[PDB]
Specification:
The complex is a heterohexamer of chains A (about 475), B (about 30), C (about 140), D (about 450), E (about 55) and F (about 190). By secondary structure, chain D is mostly helical. Chain D contains 18 helices and 7 strands. Chain F has one domain. In chain F, a hairpin with a 6-residue loop joins strand 1 and strand 2. The chains are: A alpha+beta (about 475), B mainly alpha (about 30), C mainly alpha (about 140), D mainly alpha (about 450), E mainly alpha (about 55), F mainly alpha (about 190).
Chain lengths: ~475, ~30, ~140, ~450, ~55, ~190
């Protein structure tokens, strides 16, 4: 039919009243109704440079206004005074027949012609151009083309991976003036702890961005079933996060306050943390050449808190989908070796329930996260990570995508059990504070991703679990599955 | 052969043409 | 990254400078070996490429580019064989076997030649102190 | 078998995530809703069919989804009569069936277009007629391509049920928050429940005086109907979780233990749809014959219309109950109507579970093909056990559907129970699909 | 009288959902229904003055 | 660009800087040309040469006889010269299944000789080349792990002996090498 607009402004006030009430009510009701120790969260910012701090720093009133408007309209309504059918609308008269009659239709047609299509096209292009992994399409194409025409003769090094990363297309959008050679030079300066002078803000950006690029490159390398490239990628990620060139004696060079010109000149036999902890406490400082107890305590505490891995039990499992399970023993570089026989074996056993048998990874997903890493030179703050990869032993080719685990308990590294030192050498296993049920043992479950071979016999495998932030000792074991039917 | 953005653009052009014809026929009677 | 245009350049130079004849046949054999190597590479890489494409982490246009290059390589090899028959009559049945042998032969030769450069890489990476005779002096 | 060169949208080669599919469904629904609001240019029935076909007169969507639904039902009948003899072993046959569906939908569109432009009340007097025909033709093509796109994989599911649920939810929201006003003697009155409620609460400032009147609203929808509607909504929601699960295990590969669920509303959509369709057709035919034929023995026996409503006849018993008043006046009529609707929905559920190819024998054959077997039962008894659960489940589901529908029709909710249950089952299917798939 | 007995036995054999999943189910379905209904209501409301001014 | 020699008929790129792939293709073409010059028959057969193989055998025997004479220095030089001649003066279009095994046989003896002499880096590189070119035998893992232990790389030594045991678990020397590597690594860390 034909309605009649409100010219007395008597009908729209209650409409706006209920419209604002229905939105304020539930929001106000909702507003009314509304595990893993970390020791580096304080020490990281203690050694971070000022420029990096500045870079990281640079890089509800709706309720009250609704209540105010509600009060205003309520008072305005209270100030007001006030057989055939007469249809009418609540919309006022001026908004439809006043001087602003074409304004509504022109803004409507504008919003429907230029606002919606342009925005939806931009959003669609942005969501389509990017890969599912989280990188650009051009970078993925470049990585694939590079791995395609790769001579097996050339041995993989860090400089080769840096040169490959220097062609990242997502770096061009950040700085359309720079060149790939400039990116390579910047990354070399960062690894060698050199100053860019003026392009520090760009070096920090590209360093922060290389992370997802390296993960994508690792994924593609595991796709092409090439092991050396993946191992070199892991090493490059380590070198980047630690800001140090790859050397044989690097597990000690990753320390906060060391002088290479003194250390390398003095000794030539210290290459791991165990060999260093073999020495005395003052001997460590005299060797490192820092001669500052107030700072020696800091470097000792940071060096005695990085995790070392060690296997306890590894075996196959043959459900409908075969998957391996791991028993890892996270220990520090200072605690001595404990025999595996002392384990009560109860933590090794698994409860067999319907829910646990349905999804074994449920208990694994219960372990706490890993704390923040100690990156005195990385721009942003990162957590620890552990990526595992499995390959064959007959030919030496990767057989599946890499799995990256993040949930783990670092309880055995806390400063509570400091009596368990290596230099004591008094059989601390028979100690009054020795409680074999206090040491927690995490678990790791790795699916095979491929069905078991239909043949019968022994088939060897090899799983590696490398670090991503530190240069600790990792695992390299070979296991064989005995299909017997 | 046919992309979704093409379909959306066709629909937008259709509704735009209809409303343009409507407003043109209204203003033609209003002015003359 | 190919020696295809190199054959055409050599042909154009021979058309004017009167170079020897066997160099043309040699360059043709080299181009054929490169083409057959590329074809075998594509044949052996197709399954993993298709797997990664189905996984949804490679994009879309690269798949079509690969499918196109698949037949582009075949067309180039056919043109090369036609040019070979044009240069030498009744020399096709032996051409395939000669190509198949020289491909592997030069691949092995390059892989062996690379060790001279490969050697010092590990030296620089491990900071070894090596005197003459290849022995270690710590 | 023939050749055709027509536009068609391409399906994605890879899986579309949840976010993009949600965005596409939303924008498609928005465009479909905008199309149904624009009136024609050159211009100067039963509400039941207009609501069921998701269409309204006087706009670009006067046709609605009628051509698509008619083509789909036609090819359903052609597949049921086994005339196309379609073989699943070939994809060319499916492509030919799809191209035939498109070419028949377009010609049915143009035929209905010429029919309505020559029959409609717009008038006989030419270029205006041509442009008016072309406009609605292009609109039909656009909505057809939109449905095809939403079904290709860019959408959560089909588009017809989505549009129907959209129209139902819109009718429900409009019957509750009608901003319009009507002044008839007493004063300007809202047609929505909450709007008029807050209006009488504010302008009168008398709690006891205004509340007793705003809660009853003998002539217009009130808050009580809204409460009954949300109550039956939560009720049918709670009725969705009811499902029978039996233990199953595989025999081809060991270590495969699973659970097969059997819902209560197995094919809930079909029996209520059949009942509504037959009732609407019966009412239309009876009204037509009573308008054409003045008075005849059989015409009076099958149905007589009065104050219009049917009374004292066969069609008098098929009419749904209005409220508790007519319920308490004629209990025999209410009882016979309840028995009729229950029997109809039950037999419809039975025949549909028989004809759809989901019989206990069919699922037993499917299990034997897959090799699945019960954990604590033998192999030769799977069909015997299914015979004791599947038909009873279907009959009970149909019975509860009929009970919910008659209860909604009696309590006087905001809308008819059939549309509400259709929307709820559509939303529940979408939600369970999104949950089983895995995504935010 | 056997039909209601079979129905009672069957419903006793079905699985009634508890609150922990019922809340998620009702939340999802209510969010969907409200999201479609508000859009429909706004679209029908805004088009009325536009249709009046245009035509 | 590129210049053409007249008397030598050897193609050389006259540019100052060129790509490495271009250099490899140029060298390959030059080798092909100098082989086709020596080969006079129009349609050469994939059958290998005879006098060349005989000279290779003679040089190899002259190098081997130094071991009977207990001369450990000149034998390595003679074997290296024989391998160089066999690699250079052999036509590319010869049979692969005959050029591979002779090279493997000579390379194994050369590896053993340089390992006995006391050279480790060259022996390690040759072992890696032989393992990468498509020969997997438990007889090379022993020497590779021994060389790695001699040049103090414990992780790769452990990986190598583990892979070797993953193919010949019944060996008695691989297990001794594994024990020695485990002890050396325990000292390296602890």
């Amino acid at each position: 039919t034909n309605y009649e607009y409100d010219e007395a402004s008597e009908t729209w006030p209650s409409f706006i009243l209920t419209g604002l009430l229905m939105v304020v009510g539930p929001m106000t009701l909702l507003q009314i109704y509304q595990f893993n120790e970390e020791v580096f969260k304080n020490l990281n910012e203690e050694y971070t440079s000022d420029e990096i701090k500045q870079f990281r720093r640079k890089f509800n009133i709706i309720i009250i206004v609704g209540w105010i408007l509600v009060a205003i309209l309520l008072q305005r309504i209270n100030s007001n005074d006030a057989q055939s059918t007469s249809h009418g609308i609540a919309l006022p008269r001026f908004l439809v027949d006043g001087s602003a009659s074409p304004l509504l239709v022109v803004c409507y047609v504008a919003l429907l012609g230029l606002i919606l299509p342009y925005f939806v096209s931009r959003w669609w292009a942005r969501t389509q151009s990017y890969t599912k992994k989280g990188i650009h399409n051009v970078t993925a194409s470049n990585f694939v083309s590079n791995l395609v025409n790769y001579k097996p003769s050339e041995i993989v090094t860090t400089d080769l991976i840096l040169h490959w990363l220097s062609f990242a297309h997502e770096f061009k959008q950040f700085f359309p003036d720079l060149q790939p050679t400039d990116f390579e030079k910047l990354l070399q300066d960062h690894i060698n702890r050199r100053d860019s002078g003026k392009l520090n803000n760009a070096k920090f950006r590209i360093v922060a961005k290389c992370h997802s690029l390296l993960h994508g490159l690792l994924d593609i390398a595991c796709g092409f079933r090439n092991l050396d490239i993946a191992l070199g990628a892991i090493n490059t990620f380590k070198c980047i996060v630690q800001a140090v060139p790859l050397t044989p004696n690097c597990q000690i060079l990753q320390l906060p306050n060391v002088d290479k010109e003194h250390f390398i000149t003095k000794t030539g036999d210290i290459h791991t943390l165990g060999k260093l902890f073999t020495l005395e406490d003052a001997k460590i400082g005299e060797v490192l050449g820092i001669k500052d107890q107030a700072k020696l305590n800091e470097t000792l505490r940071v060096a005695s808190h990085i995790p070392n891995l060690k296997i306890i039990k590894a075996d196959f499992l043959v459900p409908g989908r075969p998957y391996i399970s791991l028993k890892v023993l996270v220990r520090s570089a200072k605690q001595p070796l404990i025999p595996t026989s002392l384990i009560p074996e109860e933590n090794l056993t698994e409860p067999q329930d319907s829910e646990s048998q349905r999804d074994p990874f449920a208990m694994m997903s219960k372990q706490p996260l890993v704390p923040y890493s100690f990156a005195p030179f990385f721009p942003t703050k990162r957590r620890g990570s552990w990526c595992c990869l499995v390959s064959s032993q007959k030919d030496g080719k990767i057989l599946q995508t890499p799995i990256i685990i993040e949930k783990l308990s670092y309880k055995n590294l806390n400063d509570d059990k400091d009596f368990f030192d290596k230099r004591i050498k008094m059989d601390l296993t028979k100690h009054e504070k020795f409680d074999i049920n206090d040491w927690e043992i995490g678990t790791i479950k790795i699916p095979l991703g491929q069905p078991a071979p239909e043949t019968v016999g022994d088939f060897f495998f090899r799983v590696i679990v490398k670090s991503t932030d530190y240069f600790t000792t990792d695992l390299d074991i070979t296991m064989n599955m005995k299909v017997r039917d | 052969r046919v992309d979704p953005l093409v379909v959306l653009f066709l629909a937008v052009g259709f509704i735009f043409s209809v409303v343009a014809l409507h407003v043109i026929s209204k203003v033609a009677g209003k002015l003359f | 990254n190919d020696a295809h245009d190199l054959y055409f350049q050599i042909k154009e130079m021979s058309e004017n400078e009167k170079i020897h004849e066997k160099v043309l046949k040699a360059a043709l054999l080299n181009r054929g070996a490169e083409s057959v190597r590329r074809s075998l590479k594509l044949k052996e890489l197709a399954p993993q490429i298709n797997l990664l494409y189905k996984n949804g982490s490679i994009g879309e246009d690269y798949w079509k580019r690969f499918e196109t290059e698949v037949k582009l390589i075949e067309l180039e090899f056919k043109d090369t064989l036609q040019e070979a028959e044009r240069l030498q009559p009744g020399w096709v049945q032996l051409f395939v076997m000669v190509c198949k042998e020289i491909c592997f032969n030069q691949a092995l030769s390059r892989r062996y030649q690379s060790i001279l450069k490969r050697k010092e890489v590990c030296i620089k990476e491990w900071e070894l102190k090596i005197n003459n005779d290849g022995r270690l002096v710590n | 078998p023939f050749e055709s060169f027509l536009p068609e949208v391409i399906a994605p080669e890879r899986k579309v995530p949840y976010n993009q599919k949600l965005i596409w469904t939303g924008v498609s629904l928005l465009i479909f809703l905008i199309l149904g609001q624009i009136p024609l240019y050159g211009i100067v029935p039963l509400y039941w069919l207009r609501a069921m076909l998701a269409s309204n007169r006087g706009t670009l969507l006067e046709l609605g989804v009628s051509p698509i639904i008619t083509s789909s039902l036609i090819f359903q009948f052609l597949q049921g009569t086994q005339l196309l003899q379609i073989r699943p072993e070939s994809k060319q046959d499916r492509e030919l069936f799809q191209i035939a569906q498109k070419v028949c939908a377009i010609i049915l569109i143009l035929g209905q277009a010429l029919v309505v432009v020559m029959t409609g009340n717009y008038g006989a007097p030419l270029p205006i007629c041509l442009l008016l025909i072309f406009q609605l033709m292009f609109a039909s093509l656009i909505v057809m391509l939109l449905d095809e796109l939403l079904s290709k994989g860019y959408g959560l599911g089909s588009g017809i049920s989505l549009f129907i649920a959209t129209n139902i939810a819109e009718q429900i929201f409009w019957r509750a928050f009608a901003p319009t006003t009507v002044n008839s003697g007493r004063g300007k009155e809202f047609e929505g429940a909450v709007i008029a409620f807050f209006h009488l609460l504010a302008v009168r400032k008398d709690k006891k005086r205004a509340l007793v009147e705003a809660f009853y609203r003998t002539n217009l929808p009130n808050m009580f109907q809204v409460l009954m509607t949300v109550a039956i909504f939560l009720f049918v929601l709670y009725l969705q979780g009811f499902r029978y699960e039996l233990p199953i295990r595989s025999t081809k590969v060991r270590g495969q233990i699973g659970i097969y669920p059997i819902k209560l509303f197995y094919t809930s959509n079909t029996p209520i749809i059949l009942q509504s369709a037959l009732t609407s057709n019966i009412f239309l035919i009876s009204q037509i014959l009573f308008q054409k034929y003045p008075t005849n023995p059989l015409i009076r026996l099958i149905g007589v219309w009065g104050i219009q409503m049917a009374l004292s006849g066969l069609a008098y018993y098929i009419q749904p109950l209005m409220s508790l008043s007519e319920a308490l006046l004629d209990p025999i009529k209410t009882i016979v109507y309840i028995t009729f609707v229950l029997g109809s929905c039950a037999v419809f559920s039975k025949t549909w579970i028989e004809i759809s190819g989901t019989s206990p024998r069919d699922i037993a054959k499917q299990f034997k093909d897959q090799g699945m077997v019960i954990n604590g039962k033998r192999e030769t008894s799977i069909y015997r056990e299914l015979k004791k659960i599947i038909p009873t489940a279907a009959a009970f589901g149909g019975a509860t559907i009929g009970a919910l529908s008659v209860g909604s029709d009696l309590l006087g909710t905001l809308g008819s129970g059939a549309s509400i249950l259709l929307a709820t089952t559509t939303i529940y299917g979408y939600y369970e699909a999104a949950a089983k798939e895995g995504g935010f | 009288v056997e039909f209601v007995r079979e129905g009672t036995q069957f419903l006793a054999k079905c699985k009634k959902p508890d609150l922990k999943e019922y809340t998620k189910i009702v939340k999802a379905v209510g969010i969907g229904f409200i999201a479609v209904g508000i859009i429909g209501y706004a679209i029908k409301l805004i088009h009325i003055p536009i249709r009046y001014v245009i035509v | 660009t590129l210049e053409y020699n007249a008397n030598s008929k050897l193609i050389t790129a006259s540019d100052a800087v060129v790509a490495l792939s271009t250099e490899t293709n140029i060298d390959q073409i030059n080798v092909l040309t100098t082989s086709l010059i020596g080969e006079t028959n129009p349609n050469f057969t994939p059958q290998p040469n005879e006098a060349l193989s005989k000279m290779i055998k003679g040089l190899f025997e002259s190098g081997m006889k130094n071991l009977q004479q207990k001369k450990l220095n000149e034998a390595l030089k003679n074997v290296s010269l024989a391998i160089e001649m066999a690699q250079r003066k052999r036509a590319p279009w010869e049979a692969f299944a005959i050029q591979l095994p002779e090279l493997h046989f000579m390379l194994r003896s050369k590896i053993d000789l340089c390992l006995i002499l006391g050279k480790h880096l060259e022996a390690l590189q040759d072992l890696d080349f032989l393992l990468g070119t498509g020969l997997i035998q438990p007889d090379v893992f022993v020497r590779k792990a021994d060389c790695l232990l001699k040049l103090r790389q414990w992780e790769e030594a452990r990986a190598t002996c583990e892979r070797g045991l993953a193919l010949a678990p019944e060996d008695m020397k691989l297990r001794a090498l594994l024990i020695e590597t485990a002890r050396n690594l325990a000292e390296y860390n602890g």
